[PDB]
Copies of this chain bind each other. A is one copy, B any other.
Amino acid sequence: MIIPALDLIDGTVVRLQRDYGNDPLPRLQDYAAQGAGVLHLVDLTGAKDPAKRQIPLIKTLVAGVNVPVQVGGGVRTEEDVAALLKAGVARVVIGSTAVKSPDVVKGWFERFGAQALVLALDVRIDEHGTKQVAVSGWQENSGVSLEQLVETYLPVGLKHVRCTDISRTLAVSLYEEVCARYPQIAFQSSGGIGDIDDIAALRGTGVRGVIVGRALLEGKFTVKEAIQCWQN
């Protein structure tokens, strides 16, 4: 499915910064109205300072739509995960902590269940062609491949992985490769959607979810058009 996404800084919708106003709820509602089955929020404020996690805003946004929302942004502890779920989020997106403390995060899978957690990985394809995991675009590789890290969490029932290629718009071997290798996992693609043809290009790769953020804000296409393209 198409997964429309917003990034939020102190209540403001931003592009990766470009300011798109302080109306996240009507935007999300219109995404849902066009048929989106899942939405994605990134709490950039919380990612910078966990004490400033925008729980009240997140609570309002979730309450204001009729579809599950996956939310990420500096999720560091068990308490972070529980607080988001409690605020009504459907799935918590775990990024750097999943690279840095797998034994701890494996425990979270056991407590919350794999249906409640999405593992978000940044991938650089190195000179040799290995899928190197990195915790952000501005940090060096962490010394683990995408496959190794995925296989670390398969024993606790990993179901949802969000992959961003940070070595690369999409108009796809990477997605074809990992989706074929782990057909029991639903992979999401993030980044590289500049226009509608980028979505078409992901068709057939095996990717389950296509995250779309800035192209919608920029008015390149609508959620309805993205879904029509995706469903072909």
Contact = CB atoms under 8 A, between A and B. Distances in A.
Interface in A144-198: 173, 176-177, 179-180, 183
A17 B211 CA distance: 51
Contacts of A180: 128-130
A88 interface: no
Interface of A: 128-130, 173, 176-177, 179-180, 183, 205-206
Contacts of A173: 173, 177
Contact of A129 (B128, B129, B206): B206
Nearest to A183: B128
A173 B176 CA distance: 10
Nearest to A174: B173
A174 to B, nearest CB: 9
Contacts of A129: 176-177, 179-180, 205-206
A129 B176 CA distance: 6
14 contacts: A128-B179, A128-B180, A128-B183, A128-B206, A129-B176, A129-B177, A129-B179, A129-B180, A129-B205, A129-B206, A130-B180, A173-B173, A173-B177, A177-B177
A179 B127 CA distance: 12
9 nearest A-B residue pairs (beta carbon): A129-B180, A129-B176, A173-B173, A128-B180, A130-B180, A177-B177, A129-B206, A128-B206, A129-B177
Contacts of A130: 180
Nearest to A127: B204
Nearest to A131: B180
A205 B173 CA distance: 14
Contacts of A205: 129
Nearest to A175: B129
Contacts of A179: 128-129
